[PDB]
Amino acid sequence: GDRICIGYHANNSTTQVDTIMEKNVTVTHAQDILEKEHNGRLCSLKGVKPLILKNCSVAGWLLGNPMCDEFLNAPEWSYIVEKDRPSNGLCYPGTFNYYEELKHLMSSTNQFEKIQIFPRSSWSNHDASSGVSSACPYNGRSSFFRNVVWLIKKNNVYRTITRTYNNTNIEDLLIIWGIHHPNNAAEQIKLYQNPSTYVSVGTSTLNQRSIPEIATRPKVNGQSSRMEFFWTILRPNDSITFESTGNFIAPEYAYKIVKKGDSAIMKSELSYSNCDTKCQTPVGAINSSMPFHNVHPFAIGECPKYVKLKKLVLATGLRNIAGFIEGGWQGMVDGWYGYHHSNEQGSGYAADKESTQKAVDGITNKVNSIISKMNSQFEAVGKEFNNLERRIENLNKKMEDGFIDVWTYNAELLVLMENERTLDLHDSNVKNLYDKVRRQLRDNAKELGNGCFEFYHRCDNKCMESVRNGTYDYPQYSEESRLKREEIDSGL
Amino acid sequence: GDRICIGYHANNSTTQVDTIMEKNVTVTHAQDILEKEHNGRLCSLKGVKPLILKNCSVAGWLLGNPMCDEFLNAPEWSYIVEKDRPSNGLCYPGTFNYYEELKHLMSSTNQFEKIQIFPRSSWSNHDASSGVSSACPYNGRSSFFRNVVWLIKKNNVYRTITRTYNNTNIEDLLIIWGIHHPNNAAEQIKLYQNPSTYVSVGTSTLNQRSIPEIATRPKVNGQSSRMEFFWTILRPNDSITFESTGNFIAPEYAYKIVKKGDSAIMKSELSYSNCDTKCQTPVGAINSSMPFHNVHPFAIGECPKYVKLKKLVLATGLRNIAGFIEGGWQGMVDGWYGYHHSNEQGSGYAADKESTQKAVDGITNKVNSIISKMNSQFEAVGKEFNNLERRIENLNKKMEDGFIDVWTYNAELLVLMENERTLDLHDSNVKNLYDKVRRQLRDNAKELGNGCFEFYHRCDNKCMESVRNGTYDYPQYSEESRLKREEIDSGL
Amino acid sequence: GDRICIGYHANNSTTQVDTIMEKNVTVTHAQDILEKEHNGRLCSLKGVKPLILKNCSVAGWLLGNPMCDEFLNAPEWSYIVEKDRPSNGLCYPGTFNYYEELKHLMSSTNQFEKIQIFPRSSWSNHDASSGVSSACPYNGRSSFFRNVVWLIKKNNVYRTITRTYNNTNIEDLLIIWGIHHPNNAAEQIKLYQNPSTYVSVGTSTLNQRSIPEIATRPKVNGQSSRMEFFWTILRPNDSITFESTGNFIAPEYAYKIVKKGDSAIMKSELSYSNCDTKCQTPVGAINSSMPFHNVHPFAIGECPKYVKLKKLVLATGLRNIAGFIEGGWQGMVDGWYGYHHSNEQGSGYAADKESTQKAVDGITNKVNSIISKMNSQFEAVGKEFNNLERRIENLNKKMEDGFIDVWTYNAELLVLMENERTLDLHDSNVKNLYDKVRRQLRDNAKELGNGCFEFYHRCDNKCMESVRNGTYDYPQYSEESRLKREEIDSGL
């Protein structure tokens, strides 16, 4: 009789982690750090709503396609939401030069303010009310973009146009003008009368003439002609002058860039519900508490970092279930490691929070420190490209997948590598706890091989805990012990 | 007399791995996972042959340079093979607009079918048989591209051309046309007679006029004039119309994109031998059994992942060579760890496949699991760029080297890091095996310090293996043992 | 009496490293490998000075803006130094086509030699001395770019120009020409008299007409007109021909690319001091002895690798402070591990350089081997982009930050991971050293639990070191020992 056993915690936990060498091992304490859920809505970002283009495209909005809403309030936005194939773009066919680059400039701007530079009624020298077309219905009557004017000959004449705008604001200004390409030569004179025309624009930074390419093309929303648009940022103090003898499509309104910052053009077929998140994906929002998610690679806001995994669980606790050789003590709470009182007066299971506090520490200090090392992890950024930019487009994707594949690898093999060390730690602690016991009770005790000690003396409860504190003095029971040792020697 | 010794395997192996801390350490069992060989041929990919352009370039092929083969069979291809500096490109000098982007579109397409849109004999209004040139010999007589027609004035007139093609197929169609730039004004009238000409093309997505730039340049394959080509993809249901009053170079044949998928334009001076691989490099094929190779960074097919190393060896077995303290037991087969019978009846070397099966397991389960984590590793993709695209070209290469340098680093430091843990495992197993022995034979045995036990009792062969199974009961020999212990005490 | 104790080194060191699990742990021996200092000057690279543009831009230099220095010596350069917003660029306003790509070509070229192709006095057919302007003062009188000529009508006529240059040199040649865009039609005739003009250039590789876009723009350094420049590399054996009837701005001097290699255009507001480094950043030079620095991401030369850290310390030695259980022996020099002579004749502290030499080895062999694995680490490369290239610009930066964030992560978690293994090694060594002692002195000694042994016999100094060498024979003192053991048994 009279013993002591060194064991470890074990409990109702059934969550199970993986490591490099073994897989799905059951553990007691562990933390999942993958987010895999989303609410499937489109929401404001930390209070500020997205600009939702609805069925319109960025171009249809900026030009004022009769079908597209204007934002008369001049709001700021957390991000912009375009559908994947918007219905309302260039109602009048044509192309929009360096369009993809303009959108990119949107991504770093948060608030426009539409302002009027060339009032539609100030074109005393031409017809400003004819330039409309069936290709651009509004309320089922022919019409036209609202923010640029399709100036037409007046009383069979088209006086060469020179008009300037001196940008006297603090902000940069986005301005869009355009030029008309007719079907045939008859139509050219029919609208503008000068056989040969041009549209030239001048700033400090930007010199460009433009001339109408007359060619027969197929009908598109009613129209074999096309109209080509251009744009520039006119810096504060600079001015812009338009020269034309025809085909000029004049800006009425400019766009004041009043707040630049972080935004994006998110492509999603969702529409806004009354809902605010920290982190938004084109398929829903994200409850950004975990450090990792696998929901979508284009997320914006205060987001966890995206990895291509289906599982990511940190191990922090123990493996699940007399003597540590034979498994764990379900009968332990109030600690991770410890002992067992089998005494003249005893009954077991007091912990060694000496070493459990020192281990609950460096475990939670290691897992924090793990989230933190991917602070700088690759987040992906939206960009678009045209049908003659395929090479670059694929470049970009290889870059974004390239970094995701990398960080996903980092993410995994960090978890499993430290998982193995977390568990190698417990095995170490247990056998260490053992030793501080063994190396103080030395001649007075039997190494029962299970991981327990039988006493050649009597310990008692105050000397019992005197093994916890490393207190035990070999001498105070030395001579008592040496007697019974040499009885079992030559006894029984 | 009467003993037992705990030892580990050791054998004729001489393959040697590295780790972080020590280098070239000799081991017993290990697996090389670098491929470094190649057969130096160009082969089909899993049954399907490459399109081999021979001395021709992608342009010379697509336009039908008289020197280039046509593919009348309409085959599909695993990949396309261009030489590095092909001899047959634009036989007639000029430039090929957005050529580099066209090639990129090749890389994602597997099978053309040439079809005739504008039959050469249907140009009743012009001379279709004169447009040939010494710059384009076929059989040593002047000639010209085969898939586009160099329409010339007929009987000193050049009626303005309008011709359309409505694309009624399911597939996209690649079409190439072109415009002629003459030496001087005399030549312009000499061939097309209208002093001022244009070439305009119209689709839904594409509006472009083109006008001849008349300038004296140096002779190139006979010709100071140049000819500029263009191309577009005409989508199903769309149509295309060409307008010209001169210099038009008309398509005869279009190209039906009938199979898109994974392919590439591989630059190699090899030519095809009768040979099929899974993985092909521009210097030869690859016996894709290893997870890594260092042969070439542009490989295509079911390929191992390329790393810039010269060695990559996993350690899975032991280090090479009474008692484990002093090295390994060459005299062990049928296991990795185990013992030795030195008995009244004994002779040594029965294994502990208890722990060897449990370790041959997690070793082969770890090495599989290592190949798998680079499942998502960066493979590089061919792209070309023109002399005004250098920035992007270098961008791309920095990206591709950037990811290769990364994954090569991952690859190495995965091997060495787990190599060190594989070997730390064996040391652990050996000393653990020891303990399950020691902790059952306790008072009845002498800890000879070599890693062996001498018996204060007698064991015998059935109790012998009774240490393997953890079977041994201390009591059944306890009193027998305690006698001889206290004889060596106060004996001899 | 009569004992022996196994302990480890401990000393005045106070440098402290981190690992994954614990942080700032004090150690004895360690090596910092982060560089964080710089001298704040601009210096030659290994003997060869930078080309310092001063207040001029690459364009103002190459064109010979009257304000910019010429380099009459034809020097080679280690790298080029542009200020961030240079004062002297196009003194005459306009734009410089594919400028950003030209600069990139600078980065891979080390030495020009200006040579004269079209001598300014050889324009017998036009006015070569009028083409000057207030926009380009030199000594406060109107003037003009020095390396191109603003040819003007002579005696009210402008004979169509045809001039050629056959490039008969071995080197490539950079040539720049230009075309003038006037305010209005009156000015066009005023200078060149032909109402309609062109500027066409012909090489093997390059065919381009150019025509003056006449439009009113705002005054810039005096001038509402603009002038547009172009450039090409004319390969050896090729020729170039310029055709014009007006607005031609003719090259006088070409640039011989005579040494290509590694250089760069470094943007810095510093100016050169008399100073040479191996590694230069736009904020100063770098004492490139460490493997890592955090000074600046664009460094050039024989540079350490840049990481975004503030600390990077390798641990190689021990943790700081009878028996190893209780800390380290300040009283040890001449080794890392070892013992202590407490003997009939003894006094302690002789080392076990058996195992210290074997550990000082694999520690310095591991730290070298760590610097080496980032041999291939991502270094960043300068590139510039125009206001319509934003997408690509941001692509590039995401790429360069993307790889830096990665390698910074690698760098850190390599240090901390091996730091933990370096320290796990010492704990291992110490307890191992212990064992080679314990397993030879076995029955003759008391395992005092502190990590020391008391002798049931007497050892003496020659048997003392006989524990170092593993020499000790159990038998020579066995019978002497067994006597006193069985006295403490049944004694006192």
Identity of residue A57: S
Q: Are residues B56 and B196 in the same domain?
A: yes
Q: List chain A residues with CB under 8 Å of C397.
A: none
What DSSP designation does C436 have? H
Which CATH number covers residue C92? 3.90.209.20
Best mutation target, A102, A179, A244, A376, to test chain C (most C CBs within 10 A): A376
A275 and A262 co-located in one domain: no
Q: Which of A214, A389, A409 sits opposite B373 (nearest CB)?
A: A409
- The HSE-up count of residue A294 (CA atoms within 13 Å, CB side) is 13
Chains near A with 3+ CB pairs less than 8 A apart are B, C
Same domain flag for A251 and A308: no
SS3 of C42, please?
Answer: strand
Q: Which of C398, C421, C450, C485 to mutate to test the interface with A (most CBs of A within 10 A)?
A: C398
Identify the helix (H) or strand (E) that includes residue B462.
helix B461-465
Provide, as residue numbers in chain B, all residues whose Cβ is less than 8 Å from the Cβ of A409.
373-374, 376, 410
- Is the Cβ pair A100, C391 closer than 8 Å? yes
Same domain, yes or no: A31 and A161? no
Partner-chain contact A95 B207, CB within 8 Å: yes
Q: Are residues C96 and C245 in the same domain?
A: yes
Measured on CA atoms in the order C280, C285, C291, C293, is the torsion positive or negative? negative
Inter-chain touch C207–B213, beta carbons under 8 Å = yes
Element (H, E) at C454: strand C452-455
Cα B179 to the center of its chain, rounded Å: 40
Q: Which residue, A23, A131, C425, is CA-closest to B365?
A: A23
Per-residue exposure over B249-283, b if at least 16 CB sit within 10 Å of its own CB, e if not: bbbbbbbbbbeeeebbbbbbebeeeeeebbbbbbb
Q: What angle do CA B189, B192, B195 make, to 5 degrees?
A: 50
From the number of C-beta atoms within 10 Å of its C-beta (0-12, 13-18, 19+), residue A474 rates as middle
**Contact assignment for A105 to C390 by CB distance below 8 Å:** yes
Domain boundary among A229, A250, A270: A270
**Cross-chain Cβ contact A399/C394 below 8 Å:** no
Residue contact B412–C373, C-beta within 8 A: yes
**Tokens, residue B324:** 């484990």
Query: Which chain C residue's Cα is nearest to B220?
Result: C204
Residues B38 and B57 in one domain: no
Q: Helix A390-438 crosses helix B390-438 at what angle (to 10 degrees)?
A: 20
A-chain residues within 8 Å CB-CB of B399? 395, 398-399, 402
What's the one-letter identity of residue B23? K
DSSP result, A75-100: -B-S-EEE-SS-SBS-SS---BTTHH
Per CB-CB distance under 8 Å, the chain A contacts of C391 are 100-101, 104, 383, 385, 392
CA-based max dimension of chain C: 135
Cross-chain CB nearest to C377 (options B213, B405, B492)? B405
* B370: nearest Cα among B317, B318, B411, B425: B411
Chain B residues touching C369 at Cβ < 8 A: 20, 23
Scan for tokens 């290769």, then name that residue: B404
Considering the domain architecture, whether residues C21 and C84 belong to the same structural domain is answered as no
CA distance C40 to C38: 6
Of C21, C390, C489, the CB nearest to A104: C390
Of B270, B290, B307, the one marking the end of a domain is: B270
CB atoms within 10 A of CB C115: 13
How many whole angstroms separate alpha carbon C240 and alpha carbon C473? 95
Can you give the residue range of the structural domain that contains A75?
A: 49-270
- Is the C-alpha dihedral spanning C369, C375, C376, C377 positive or negative? positive
Same structural domain for residues A428 and A481? yes
* Phi-psi map region of B207: left, alpha, beta (phi>0 left; psi -120 to 50 alpha): beta
Return the exposure string of B479-488: e unless at least 16 CB atoms fall within 10 Å of the residue's CB, then b.
eebbeeeeee
Q: Which residues contact B302 (CB under 8 A, 6 or more apart)?
A: B46, B278, B279, B288
Tokens 């000959």 found at? A153
User: What contacts B137, CB < 8 A, 6 or more positions away?
Assistant: B66, B67, B91, B143
A213 and A305 in a common domain: no
Chain A: closest CA distance from residue C400 (Å): 11
The structure tokens listed for A400 are 């974004």
Indicate the residue of A207, A363, A482 with minimum beta-carbon distance to C213: A207
Q: CA of C359: which chain B residue's CA is closest?
A: B21
Residues B107, A394: contact at Cβ < 8 Å?
A: no
Q: Is there a contact between C233 and B308 if contact means CB atoms under 8 Å apart?
A: no
Closest Cβ opposite residue B239 in set A218, A412, A447: A218
The answer on A278 and A152 residing in a single domain is no
Which chains sit next to B, with 3 or more Cβ pairs under 8 A?
Answer: A, C
Instruction: Report angle CA C6, C7, C10 to the nearest 5 degrees.
Output: 170
Angle in degrees, CA B33, A407, C408, rounded to 5: 95
Q: Could you tell me the two tokens for B43?
A: 């082969």
Among candidate residues C443, A490, A221, C163, the one with its CA nearest the CA of residue B484: A490
| Residue (of B50, B86, B84, B93) closest to B68 by Cα position | B86
User: In whole angstroms, what is the distance from residue B76 CA to residue C273 CA?
Assistant: 64
Asked if residue B58 and residue B20 are part of one domain, the reply reads no
* Closest Cα in chain C, distance from residue A46 (Å): 25
- Closest CB from C224, C325, C409 relative to A376: C409
Chain B residues with CB inside 8 Å of A390's CB? Answer: 101, 104-105
- B338 exposure class (CB count in 10 Å sphere: 0-12, 13-18, 19+): buried
Distance from the Cα of B111 to chain C's closest Cα (Å) equals 32
C-beta of residue A111 within 8 angstroms of C-beta of residue A259? yes
- B104, B207, B438: residue with CB nearest A213: B207
Domain count, chain C: 2
C-beta atoms of C202 and B217 within 8 A: yes
Per-residue burial over B162-175, b = 16 or more CB atoms within 10 Å of its CB, e = otherwise:
ebebebeeebbbbb
Domain boundary among A248, A270, A292: A270
What is the rounded end-to-end Cα distance, in angstroms, of chain B? 15
Q: Do A204 and C215 touch (CB under 8 A)?
A: no
Residues of B in contact with C439 (CB under 8 A): 325, 449-450
Partners of residue C162 in chain B, C-beta under 8 Å:
216
Contact C181 A381 (CB under 8 A): no
User: Do A433 and A337 form a contact (C-beta atoms < 8 A)?
Assistant: yes
Q: Are residues A196 and A216 in the same domain?
A: yes
- Name which of C34, C27, C24 is nearest C411 in CA terms: C34
Task: Report the neighbours of C using a cutoff of 3 or more CB pairs below 8 angstroms.
Answer: A, B
Q: Which of B243, B376, B439 minimises the CB distance to A215? A: B243
Both tokens of residue B75?
């085959």
Contact A6, A441 (CB under 8 A): no
